[PDB]
């Protein structure tokens, strides 16, 4: 996250971190239930073996809420493609269930039609992660969040040097210096409605981070609700 602020105690409880063999985070995820994590399909290539950490806000101190979980099954969308990052979505089933507590809780899955007319027409959504603090910087040791405006679909297509498919949407700022970045990928994009937070996107890609005339590109979760439902049963 470029800009924004620290997630304070209890504020981003659905955040998950995919960690490599060295215990280093390389991508984010969203807690959907006691057994399932939502992430990006493209993240499933950045490490041979990985685990999922939850309940963490500072990677340099032990706060007492942290828990590491092994992955039992990796469910990748079969139509995923590296050429465009179309269908950039995967679901992970964990070996042991997550025990909810302070800093560890799921985000709500919304219904498609209601989310599209009512959530995605709100002024802003919230993105979060432990990724880079600027395009050429290091990863954050503190969990951060940032309010990002929804961006008009036409303006987004005009701004982009790469194809924006029906399975993607744009959010962020034209010139203001605030954006998601590398390492935040696979992480939560949520939208608040009457003090309840619903999953609306997955951090996917961008042309660098916070560049002028450029926006953050997110997987459009509302296009994948039946798919997600199916994955969480089989």
């Amino acid at each position: 996250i470029v800009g924004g602020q620290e997630c304070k105690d209890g504020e981003c409880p659905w955040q998950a971190l995919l960690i490599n063999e060295e215990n280093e985070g390389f991508c984010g995820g969203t807690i959907l239930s006691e057994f399932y994590i939502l992430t990006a399909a493209h993240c499933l290539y950045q490490a041979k073996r990985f685990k999922v950490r939850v309940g963490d806000r500072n990677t340099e101190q032990e706060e007492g809420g942290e828990a590491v979980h092994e992955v039992e099954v990796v469910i990748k969308h079969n139509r995923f493609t590296k050429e465009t990052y179309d269908f950039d979505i995967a679901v992970l089933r964990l070996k042991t269930p997550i025990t909810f507590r302070m800093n560890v809780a799921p985000a709500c899955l919304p219904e498609r039609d209601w989310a599209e007319s009512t959530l995605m027409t709100q002024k802003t959504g919230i993105v979060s992660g432990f990724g880079r603090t600027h395009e050429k910087g290091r990863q954050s040791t503190r969990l951060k969040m940032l309010e990002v405006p929804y961006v008009d679909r036409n303006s987004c297509k005009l701004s982009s040097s790469f194809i924006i498919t029906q399975n993607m949407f744009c959010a962020g700022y034209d010139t203001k210096q605030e954006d998601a970045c590398q390492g935040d990928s696979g992480g939560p994009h949520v939208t608040r409605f009457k003090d309840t937070y619903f999953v609306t996107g997955i951090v996917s890609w961008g042309e660098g981070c916070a560049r002028k005339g450029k926006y953050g590109i997110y997987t459009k979760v509302t296009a994948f609700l039946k798919w997600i439902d199916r994955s969480m049963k089989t």
Binding site: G10, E11, C12, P13, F100, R101, M102, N103, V104, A105, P106, A107, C108, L109, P110, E111, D113, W114, S117, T118, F193, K194, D195, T196, Y197, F198
Partner: protein, 52 residues
């Protein structure tokens, strides 16, 4: 009208049927007696920031 007027007074999901508002809730909530509000069924319901 209906769901386009202040989400139909619903706490969460709003749907229109036979020219009438019908409210519903995410998994882990139950619809209240008034047919509008959503009540958590147990501890740590989805979408809420944690306080204990």
């Amino acid at each position: 009208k209906l769901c386009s007027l202040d989400n139909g007074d619903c706490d969460q999901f709003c749907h229109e049927e036979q020219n009438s508002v019908v409210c519903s809730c995410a998994r882990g909530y139950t619809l209240a007696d008034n047919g509008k509000a959503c009540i958590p069924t147990g501890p740590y319901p989805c979408g809420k920031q944690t306080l204990e």
